[PDB]
Design a protein around this ligand. Sequence first.
Ligand SMILES: CCCCCCCCCCCCCCCCCC(=O)OC[C@H](COP(=O)([O-])OCC(O)COP(=O)([O-])OC[C@@H](COC(=O)CCCCCCCCCCCCCCCCC)OC(=O)CCCCCCCCCCCCCCCCC)OC(=O)CCCCCCCCCCCCCCCCC
Ligand SMILES: CCCCCCCCCCCCCCCCCC(=O)OC[C@H](COP(=O)([O-])OCC(O)COP(=O)([O-])OC[C@@H](COC(=O)CCCCCCCCCCCCCCCCC)OC(=O)CCCCCCCCCCCCCCCCC)OC(=O)CCCCCCCCCCCCCCCCC
Ligand SMILES: CCCCCCCCCCCCCCCCCC(=O)OC[C@H](COP(=O)([O-])OCC(O)COP(=O)([O-])OC[C@@H](COC(=O)CCCCCCCCCCCCCCCCC)OC(=O)CCCCCCCCCCCCCCCCC)OC(=O)CCCCCCCCCCCCCCCCC
Ligand SMILES: CCCCCCCCCCCCCCCCCC(=O)OC[C@H](COP(=O)([O-])OCC[N+](C)(C)C)OC(=O)CCCCCCCCCCCCCCCCC
Ligand SMILES: CCCCCCCCCCCCCCCCCC(=O)OC[C@H](COP(=O)([O-])OCC[N+](C)(C)C)OC(=O)CCCCCCCCCCCCCCCCC
Ligand SMILES: CCCCCCCCCCCCCCCCCC(=O)OC[C@H](COP(=O)([O-])OCC[N+](C)(C)C)OC(=O)CCCCCCCCCCCCCCCCC
Ligand SMILES: CCCCCCCCCCCCCCCCCC(=O)OC[C@H](COP(=O)([O-])OCC[N+](C)(C)C)OC(=O)CCCCCCCCCCCCCCCCC
Ligand SMILES: CCCCCCCCCCCCCCCCCC(=O)OC[C@H](COP(=O)([O-])OCC[N+](C)(C)C)OC(=O)CCCCCCCCCCCCCCCCC
Ligand SMILES: CCCCCCCCCCCCCCCC(=O)OC[C@H](COP(=O)(O)O)OC(=O)CCCCCCCCCCCCCCC
Lengths: 93, 49, 50, 318, 187, 59, 380, 53, 98, 41
Amino acid sequence: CIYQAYQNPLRHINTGHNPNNVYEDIVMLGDYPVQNRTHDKVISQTYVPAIANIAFTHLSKKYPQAGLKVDQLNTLKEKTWNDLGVNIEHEKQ
Amino acid sequence: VAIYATYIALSYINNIWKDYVVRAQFSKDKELLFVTRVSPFGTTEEEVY
Amino acid sequence: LYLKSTNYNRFDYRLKQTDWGFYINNNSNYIQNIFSGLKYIWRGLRFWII
Amino acid sequence: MNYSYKRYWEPSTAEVIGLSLSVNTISAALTYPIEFVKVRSQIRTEGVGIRSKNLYMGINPNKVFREIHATGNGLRGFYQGFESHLIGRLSYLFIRNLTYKIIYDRTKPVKAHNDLSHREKGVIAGFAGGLAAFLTSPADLVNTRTIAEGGKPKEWRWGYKGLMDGINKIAATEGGNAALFRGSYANVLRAVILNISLTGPFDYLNEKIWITFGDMTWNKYAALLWASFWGSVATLPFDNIRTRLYAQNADPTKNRLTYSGWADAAKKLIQHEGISGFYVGFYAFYIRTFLYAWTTVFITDKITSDWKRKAGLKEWQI
Amino acid sequence: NNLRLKPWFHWTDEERSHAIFSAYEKRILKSEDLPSFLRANRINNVSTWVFPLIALPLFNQSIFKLGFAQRILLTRPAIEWHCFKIATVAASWLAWLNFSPFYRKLENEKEYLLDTLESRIGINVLDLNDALPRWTTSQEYNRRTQQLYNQRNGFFAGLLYPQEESSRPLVDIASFPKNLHKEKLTK
Amino acid sequence: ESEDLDFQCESFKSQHFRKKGPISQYLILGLLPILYFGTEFFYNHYPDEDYWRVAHPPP
Amino acid sequence: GNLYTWGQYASGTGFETASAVPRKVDYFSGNVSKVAMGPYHTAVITNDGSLYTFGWGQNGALGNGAKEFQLSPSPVSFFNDKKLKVKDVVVGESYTIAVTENGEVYSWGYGGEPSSKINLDFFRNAILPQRCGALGSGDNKNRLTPQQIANLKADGYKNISGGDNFATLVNQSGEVINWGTGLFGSLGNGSDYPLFTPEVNAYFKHLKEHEGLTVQSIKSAGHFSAALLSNGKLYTFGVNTQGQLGIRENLGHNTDQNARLPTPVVDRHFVGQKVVDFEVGENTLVFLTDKNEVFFSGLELAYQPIRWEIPTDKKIVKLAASKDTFAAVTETGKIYQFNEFVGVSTNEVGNDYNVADSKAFEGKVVDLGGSYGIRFAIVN
Amino acid sequence: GSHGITKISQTQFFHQFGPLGTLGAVGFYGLTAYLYYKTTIFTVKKFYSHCIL
Amino acid sequence: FHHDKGYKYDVTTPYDQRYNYVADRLGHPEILGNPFERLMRLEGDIYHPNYLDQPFVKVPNANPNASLNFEEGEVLYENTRLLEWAKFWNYSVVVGYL
Amino acid sequence: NYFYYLDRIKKLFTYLNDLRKHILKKYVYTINHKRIAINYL
Ligand SMILES: CCCCCCCCCCCCCCCCCC(=O)OC[C@H](COP(=O)([O-])OCC(O)COP(=O)([O-])OC[C@@H](COC(=O)CCCCCCCCCCCCCCCCC)OC(=O)CCCCCCCCCCCCCCCCC)OC(=O)CCCCCCCCCCCCCCCCC
Ligand SMILES: CCCCCCCCCCCCCCCCCC(=O)OC[C@H](COP(=O)([O-])OCC(O)COP(=O)([O-])OC[C@@H](COC(=O)CCCCCCCCCCCCCCCCC)OC(=O)CCCCCCCCCCCCCCCCC)OC(=O)CCCCCCCCCCCCCCCCC
Ligand SMILES: CCCCCCCCCCCCCCCCCC(=O)OC[C@H](COP(=O)([O-])OCC(O)COP(=O)([O-])OC[C@@H](COC(=O)CCCCCCCCCCCCCCCCC)OC(=O)CCCCCCCCCCCCCCCCC)OC(=O)CCCCCCCCCCCCCCCCC
Ligand SMILES: CCCCCCCCCCCCCCCCCC(=O)OC[C@H](COP(=O)([O-])OCC[N+](C)(C)C)OC(=O)CCCCCCCCCCCCCCCCC
Ligand SMILES: CCCCCCCCCCCCCCCCCC(=O)OC[C@H](COP(=O)([O-])OCC[N+](C)(C)C)OC(=O)CCCCCCCCCCCCCCCCC
Ligand SMILES: CCCCCCCCCCCCCCCCCC(=O)OC[C@H](COP(=O)([O-])OCC[N+](C)(C)C)OC(=O)CCCCCCCCCCCCCCCCC
Ligand SMILES: CCCCCCCCCCCCCCCCCC(=O)OC[C@H](COP(=O)([O-])OCC[N+](C)(C)C)OC(=O)CCCCCCCCCCCCCCCCC
Ligand SMILES: CCCCCCCCCCCCCCCCCC(=O)OC[C@H](COP(=O)([O-])OCC[N+](C)(C)C)OC(=O)CCCCCCCCCCCCCCCCC
Ligand SMILES: CCCCCCCCCCCCCCCC(=O)OC[C@H](COP(=O)(O)O)OC(=O)CCCCCCCCCCCCCCC
């Protein structure tokens, strides 16, 4: 295992079984395969549409061109207030 | 002996208490059941069925 | 802290160039499951502390 | 052992020079054919290396000797270049002995039963041998070229007919006196290695066998065998590289495998033949070195014992 | 006695400080010999903790303006420039820790105290050393000595802490009973 | 290691045949009694350093 | 037009202090034509052919006859005095090459001469090949001022590009002429010995003769180079410091240290696709293929080319690569970036990319470039 | 400092463990560096005492 | 084909042609290998790439199927005093064992 | 190439390491009765 790669690291978990200088682990140190979606119950979403509607209506009363609509909740939630030009701090109360 | 006796006792107590169900809640569509059961130290542990 | 972060990391880039079809690249924000390693360590060492 | 030496009598510089010159002269006259066979074997194996297996791995010195003798020149063919070899050896011995004796006299310990450590003695011997080899390199070059002439094709031969003739031809044809120092670095390295790899093992084994079997007469010769073997093992690669560099003809076309230096020659040898290629003619080299050392030690010990007895030293002091 | 090896010629700084503290707490060394050592220790600590603060501006003014420093600053990443600055500062600080005149003076004062102890209790000064616990350093032992000095010279030298004066009973060791037996175990 | 099934293939060519190799070590094998006894007595100086030395009467 | 510069250090940036955010340079009155940024110095060709070199003048670089830092832009006297227009410029570690409109080629900078009379060159020459530079002089002598390369004409050449200490010229007929240090297959000629004088690439000549493959272009950075041929394939050769070559079949095999001869990149992820163009940075290689698909290798992340997940809706117009960063500019002017290339990023982020802020540059980014720690943008 | 990463937070190791993992790695590196410095100074002192003196 | 041990018919089945896993939607993160095990460097057979690369059937995905929705609904069963009973019994047994 | 000798030396190192592994597998870790008997002899 010196200057010649015989085993396949893609079919091994740890490449340190035998001394070598031509093998590297596929899952290096600091790499952690973790599921991107866990089996955790999500918070109830019953009142989220109403909260979004109320907040968007109030904010549109001050920013008519902000385009704050309930139908855009799936896409609006991914943007920040600075991108929308809305100062949520003043209107939070 | 001490280490393994403690480990065996705790693990088997947890296994005995695992079967019992503390809480059960359906999902919104009633497709999954979230079950809260006893942990090794008597706290809540989550599972999905 | 994680305002501007790419959903991929070194492991995802390495996996994109391998034949391991049983793993998929992360495509969700890590904030939801941040610091799950601590909980996994606790699960691993729970029965050994005493 | 740091106080086990008995340097109760030390020869004068003139005595050392004369005795060394005479003894080395007779030793070289006796052992020259073995060196000739070794050089011819190295030349004939250059670029090919050992290709036999197991017990046959190497070149047979007896086969080489028989092939050389079959040419019809008799035993006179094995002494070709002997004048150049003797002149070079005498110059090397003179320079090395003078430098070593001067340094040793300058830095000797006051007590008669104490001697310089083997490390310091090896340092001094290596320095003296390197200086002498650098000074007297051209003679070795001429001798090796004359020896390799027979092995090489006639068109590639140099056709030297004496030390002075060869020196003049090298200076004129190749251009400039700088051509007289070809292989000087390799010769210096060989001399240093040989000087440092002989005096250590000899004393090592001599003292160990004295401790084991007590004071006997075969101890010196057993230690000589051990030291000669280890010196050959340590020095043969450098001698082979020096021979290759000397045999390298000036015209690149003539050379079967041209070299640019010591490192280049070593790389080419490794590439075209295994690491064992450095040890072609090892048996011949070992026989040559052992015979030379044995005759020199025997004659020097006899003469030194006679001189000590004349001076009046006690039996144990001698 | 230049060629005479003192009993503690092989003791480290930690061992010497521990010996001083042990002598002071056992009352072999009186409180009247400490103040110079305490002042030297405090000065050494101040110098050790203040050296980099004074050195880094000096490096900015003198060294970091040199040709090679400017080359590194202008031709390599700012991170590498910071690494070079930190490395040189750390090397200078280590050199100071090794060869501080204040550290040398503190060691000399410790040597004087050890000489006084040797004169007072003969060769038994070697009995003041023990297997010092790991990670306990000469600075820690000096701090402990300073704390004991403050406790003994404070207002609570007899209310909250033991007094410096010794009130041991006056008896004869050659005849007074001993708590341990040479070979056997007593009841 | 973890890429090959633990089994013996049908082909008989997989049989592990013994083939003679280098012969140098067999020189030491043949000389082993000499070497072993030398190590036992001369190297370890057993039973003492004077038994194997040439005998000399006391002064 | 106007220039914009940024990077980790301010050697060839034209300023005295580094700045991650782009800084506007208007020393050229909107007449910048070409810019070449090396590790420590930069060369700019204006519309009228004037050449301005600035940065670290080590080994007689910048064509000024000195060996000191000259951060501010300054004209090249050798060309300005004679009014000899410069067509193209190549900047390397410590050398610069200029190709004029008449075909004449000049060079100046490091040539491989020993730094000092005392050194370990005696031991180094017995292990490694003799040091050599990108100068076509024929000897290891530094050129403090521009000097013409003898027997070297470049008229109508397809491309010219140089690495740290080597240079290559691909002509209109597909002939490739290389010079400099060919160690570790930097030149792709299969020999590690230095080439003091220009020589025709035997490997490329043989390829053209037998297989009929013509070298479309060659781009080099550091000790690595990549060549695009007539077919839609990239061939890499050099030192694979961080997987730039993209020739690792098995991710866990460290057998791709270097490639003496041009080896094709791994076509696993773009089977059936032809590379449209490519860009090479110090530790990266990013190429666009005719499906409007961007693939990248290097940065110690991808040892074989893998697809960048930027949207393919808008055709990719320009590519740029640099140390640990790269970017792609689309038709609409949108700039996608892997790592902080521009230095300013918007809140729009993707799986493996960000969007550079358009407010950094005052105008439309006509060109982007820079491959050694410092990056530049030509904005009109 | 590798792959263009300029922040600790951009590491999956930090994602999984965080500040405590960073502290552990820093402590390990510092300990090994301290031991390396100690052995290096010991070797330098030995060289000065033996080879020179 | 493997000359020393293989046969003419040793043809591998493509991964895309391997049968999919449809037994259940819930994921099986055991295949991934938890971060604790990864950090400890422990080698487990459950998350070994070679053993996971089955010839004819795909192993279940570590993540739950996108069809499943994990939004909480309504509680069916709830016996909270079991936690207190378990804590009491566990502490009592630990104390007695000590 | 400029490192043909180095390539040969690398081949030698690979051969030596492979021989070490083979010897350990065949004569140290082996369970073959004939090899065990030869070692016993
Ligand atoms: C392999 C089998 C594996 C499987 C097992 C199979 C079954 C077998 C099992 C065997 C089990 C063990 C049996 C023995 C019992 C254990 C040992 C024991 O108890 O013995 C007592 C033990 C051994 O000593 P001793 O025999 O009693 O004698 C001690 C006396 O002080 C005497 O000291 P001295 O100063 O008088 O010495 C004189 C010195 C003077 O010799 C010289 O001439 C030296 C100066 C000139 C040399 C020029 C050479 C040029 C070569 C070409 C250029 C260089 C490249 C080539 C490679 C070399 C350079 C790296 O020469 C000698 O030492 C003569 C005896 C040795 C033969 C000569 C060859 C070796 C010389 C050492 C250097 C080369 C080492 C190569 C690597 C190791 C090979 C085995 O005694 C001690 O406790 C003292 C030890 C002192 C230190 C030496 C320790 C041994 C060597 C260590 C490695 C050295 C490496 C050096 C090179 C490093 C890289 C640069
Ligand atoms: C991968 C390797 C791993 C390690 C193992 C190593 C294995 C090696 C072999 C296999 C591999 C291939 C080789 C690799 C070599 C690598 C090293 C290297 O670079 O060496 C090349 C180096 C040089 O080789 P080269 O480059 O081929 O050149 C040699 C040519 O033969 C030179 O040509 P030439 O022979 O025709 O010489 C002509 C002569 C022409 O003569 C001249 O010098 C001309 C100029 C001066 C003229 C005047 C001279 C004096 C007279 C006038 C004085 C003034 C007037 C006085 C009054 C009037 C009366 C005279 O020139 C010379 O004298 C020499 C050339 C330099 C001349 C320039 C000026 C030098 C000034 C300083 C020296 C002065 C004193 C020199 C003489 C000695 C003292 C007496 O050779 C070596 O180092 C030898 C081998 C290595 C030895 C050390 C041992 C290392 C290994 C230790 C064991 C390791 C074991 C563990 C494994 C470790 C793994 C890493
Ligand atoms: C305005 C009014 C202000 C009034 C003042 C008060 C209020 C203001 C704030 C006060 C704040 C107080 C802070 C106190 C703590 C810090 C100071 C302290 O106690 O020092 C310990 C130490 C205590 O010693 P000492 O009692 O004074 O005795 C000194 C005697 O002369 C003879 O002693 P020695 O030298 O023989 O003994 C040296 C050392 C014996 O050597 C050792 O034992 C050290 C072994 C290696 C430790 C490595 C740790 C990693 C960090 C290393 C340092 C930073 C990186 C350096 C990088 C250098 C290269 C660039 O002894 C010890 O110190 C033993 C301590 C062992 C406990 C270690 C604790 C755990 C460490 C690991 C933590 C992470 C993992 C576990 C986490 C667990 C979580 C639950 O202080 C020193 O003496 C150090 C002197 C300076 C040495 C500098 C060396 C080079 C590094 C500095 C330059 C580069 C800096 C780069 C970063 C810059 C930006 C941050
Ligand atoms: C004044 C009158 C009184 C008597 C005076 C003395 C008479 C003449 C004596 C002449 C010298 C005789 C000895 C010559 C050498 C040995 C014999 C011989 O022919 O050899 C020539 C051999 C040559 O033999 P050759 O084999 O070449 O002979 C010719 C061969 N054919 C026919 C094939 C062409 O040696 C040489 O001539 C060259 C080397 C000489 C120098 C080196 C000598 C080394 C050996 C020295 C030690 C002693 C050797 C003898 C040992 C046995 C006897 C003790
Ligand atoms: C990675 C490769 C790096 C290569 C380059 C850098 C590393 C170089 C390392 C060199 C090591 C040299 C070791 C010398 C041999 C010592 C061996 C030893 O200790 O043996 C035990 C003995 C120790 O003997 P002792 O004196 O202690 O006593 C022996 C007896 N008893 C055991 C009872 C005490 O030493 C020797 O026998 C050494 C003899 C040789 C000494 C001379 C060596 C060469 C010196 C050359 C000087 C310069 C010449 C001129 C040069 C001109 C051009 C510049
Ligand atoms: C009593 C105990 C003490 C004993 C002291 C006395 C001396 C002991 C000497 C022991 C060593 C003996 C060596 C024998 C050498 C071989 C002899 C022979 O005939 O075989 C020739 C053979 C073959 O030689 P060859 O290659 O020249 O063969 C020539 C081949 N043809 C003919 C085709 C040209 O040698 C070998 O096969 C190799 C021998 C050396 C093995 C070395 C093993 C150790 C390697 C360690 C490397 C570590 C590297 C670390 C750096 C990082 C690496 C990535
Ligand atoms: C092990 C740790 C060291 C580092 C890692 C390993 C790297 C080095 C590996 C070297 C392996 C051995 C190489 C040489 C193999 C020779 C094989 C052989 O015998 O060829 C047939 C040759 C043939 O020679 P011949 O031509 O005389 O043939 C006579 C035989 N007939 C007549 C039948 C042809 O045999 C010999 O020469 C026998 C003696 C060989 C001695 C080899 C010694 C090698 C030493 C190299 C380093 C220098 C010495 C250093 C130590 C001592 C001094 C301090
Ligand atoms: C048959 C002999 C050749 C065997 C070759 C194969 C085996 C390898 C070599 C084994 C050793 C061979 C004997 C000589 C060296 C002994 C060294 C030793 O430790 O002895 C010290 C021992 C005692 O040493 P000591 O008692 O001072 O201390 C030894 C070390 N301590 C302190 C740890 C105890 O001495 C003896 O046993 C006397 C040995 C006398 C041998 C005489 C015959 C051989 C001499 C000529 C050899 C010529 C060829 C070169 C050698 C063979 C080829 C390399
Ligand atoms: C004794 C101290 C001497 C002073 C210098 C000490 C430090 C030397 C550090 C460099 C050593 C070489 C590293 C490998 C370089 C390389 O190309 O490494 C790669 C090449 C091989 O390239 P490939 O990847 O193509 O195979 O390796 C070699 O060529 C190794 C040759 C042997 C080297 C032996 C060790 C050095 C010997 C001493 C003289 C060194 C002179 C030159 C110094 C720069």
